């Protein structure tokens, strides 16, 4: 009656295509699967429908190929996340602080070749993160203007110039910015401009805090009403970026 069904193997497959039923004496030849290689090259792998209607005994014949081992790129590292360079395993590339990755971070062990295995991508490099000097602004000299390039985390501080005339400047934005990316700084070069707010006045209400001669940017003035009045607006104002009291001035209604 024969042997109708053949057992599937880990590392092998029938070389050609199978028919529904086999009769005794016939043989199925096996071959390494993709990504495998012979355990003992040359050794012919085949099942034989024996005369007892069973399939003969065939040991496992191939073994997972492996992509070449990989070295850590300079200033970085390669991670065998799967614990080997086996076929069907992936590696991750990462760079040390101060360094960015140039290339493809994840590489795959693939049977790109009809015969043989190779990584899907070449290894990246790790390039040091050097960003160019920040732009000077109006009356704004950054530190190390004389310097030509800043490495990672080098920090520049922005200096407002001396007064053009009577009233001095007030540096809007953040004075200190740092080199955090290969071509990136952390903050925009901050505007340095004379910011002064109008003296805060309130009918029936005294100025509790402040009294600064000139209320420059970020000055802060607390205000409260005179005896008998109930506050209606917000007690604390802040000299604004646009020289406007932020928020609006309070009122002191009966
Ligand atoms: C190998 O590791 C990666 C990352 O954890 C995971 O995505 C993948 O499934 C793993 N593959 C194997 C064969 O373990
Ligand atoms: C690898 O880099 C790509 C961009 O090249 C990014 O989209 C991806 O999230 C990164 N993955 C890892 C594990 O670093």
Author numbering: 41 to 294
What is the paper's account of this structure, in its own sentences?
When responding to complement activation, CD46 binds the complement activation fragments C3b and C4b, which have been deposited on the host cell. CD46 then facilitates the cleavage and inactivation of these complement activation fragments by acting as a cofactor for serine protease factor 1.
Bovine CD46 (bovCD46) in particular is involved in bovine viral diarrhoea virus entry, an economically important disease in cattle industries. One of the two monomers in the asymmetric unit only had electron density for SCR1-3—this was likely due to the interdomain flexibility in the structure. An extension of the CD’ loop in SCR3 affected the SCR3–SCR4 domain interface. This loop contained an insertion of five hydrophobic residues causing it to adopt an extended conformation protruding from the bottom of the domain. The protrusion perturbed the head-to-tail domain interface found between the other SCRs in the protein and caused the bend between SCR3 and SCR4. An intriguing feature of these two crystal structures was the crystallographic dimer formation, which was identical in both protein constructs, despite them varying in size, unit cell, and space group.
